[PDB]
Amino acid sequence: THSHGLFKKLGIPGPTPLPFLGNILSYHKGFCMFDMECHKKYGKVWGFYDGQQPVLAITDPDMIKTVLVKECYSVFTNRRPFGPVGFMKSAISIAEDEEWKRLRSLLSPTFTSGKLKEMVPIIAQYGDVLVRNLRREAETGKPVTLKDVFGAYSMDVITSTSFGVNIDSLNNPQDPFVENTKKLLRFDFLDPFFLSITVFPFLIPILEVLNICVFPREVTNFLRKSVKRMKESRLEDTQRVDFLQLMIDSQNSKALSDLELVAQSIIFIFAGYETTSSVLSFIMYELATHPDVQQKLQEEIDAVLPNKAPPTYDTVLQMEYLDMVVNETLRLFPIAMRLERVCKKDVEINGMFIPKGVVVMIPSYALHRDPKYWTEPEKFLPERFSKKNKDNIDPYIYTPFGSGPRNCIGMRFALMNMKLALIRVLQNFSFKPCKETQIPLKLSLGGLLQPEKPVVLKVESR
């Protein structure tokens, strides 16, 4: 069709697109399976069409460095719009160019290393709440689904970190916070909705005037109201480690508005709830099928925290094997699966002409299992991230949190949150593979990096 011969004139290989659909039919295997096959059959640079949208893939470490870091403010500044956003266009994940840069500056100090340390005692409380709910799950003598136990944990962490709500979601699934926020699940970009708007981007402005938000409108307006109360409450109840409080005090001394305040608060829930629980589920699956890793990690946790001591910001950064377990799991399962930037002008990178409007993509999943940089990619070997080999890995091939000024702003919080859970659970429980566990864990064929069957493991007390 119109914009389907763009990669032909540039001499770029790629699967031949069909009219009106591009290469969306190749998504039947999923985003990750399609990327790895394209890397095999086309090399280092290829392209395809998400409907009429041309998507160029790059794997050269210097080319990835130029897109994400070097030429970021100039050319590759924003991501591809994904659907009707509504009032959430003021979200840092969705804001573009000047709005994003102002929003990121107004939100960067919220994620300081010092501000993270002040949150450790609060996140530590629900690790004990996690163990209690895990104890009854282990005494029943039946396998436990990790997504629910971790999903209850991440919900408890997000509510207590974003706001002052302290709850036990696993035992009290009726609080209005836990009810609505449980519907903030990841976007399956290969579902009937997102596939249609990817093929039909002209429908996105139509859905906006219909006030059809991509986020559940009930959750958004409820959170828009809940924040308004808590704000007024803390005002007429002046007494704080809260993402809300860290943004309210910064509102005093461009500026952050009240609706922009709510949008970022919702982002942290959406970015934190299903994302953290998935990775924690992925980590524990690998610890069960590789008990040697689970053993050396339990020993190191006891070595740094004797008598099942409470973790600390200083002690968490001390355990070297725990960081290796998390890093390797993220390599095998980078839940982003992809990094995208919109080319805002005609620019040439590393001897490649990139026309305006093309979506440049970094296939994180395809790079993490590409043999050219990893030996035995399909095997779970945490020793790749030992101190000696930690310097022999190219940071622009292994990008679980992205790179450049638009990387994951909550990287340290997410790593701290997951490790605080792993420390408190491993030093009290051991995870054994039961019968229902899928020994060859199959990944979904959709737009999410989640397991095919929910991960169920046997839990026992030490």
Ligand code: HEM
């Ligand atoms: C293991 C957990 C997590 C992983 C693997 C992860 C991964 C990512 C990735 C790959 C990106 C895109 C970066 C890129 O485009 O270069 C991103 C963006 C982002 N993440 Fe996360 N993330 C995690 C947890 C979190 C948490 C807990 C928060 C809450 C504070 C968060 C907040 C954000 C935000 C706000 C952005 C947008 C940053 C920007 O556009 O300027 N993430 N994350």
Ligand SMILES: O=C(Nc1ccccc1CCCl)Nc1cc(C(F)(F)F)ccc1-n1ccnc1
């Ligand atoms: O940007 C990303 N990448 C990413 C990262 C992990 C998994 C999936 C993906 C999307 C590619 Cl399937 N996720 C994301 C998106 C939004 C919203 F789209 F709503 F703006 C809001 C928040 C986040 N988030 C989640 C975790 N960390 C940031």
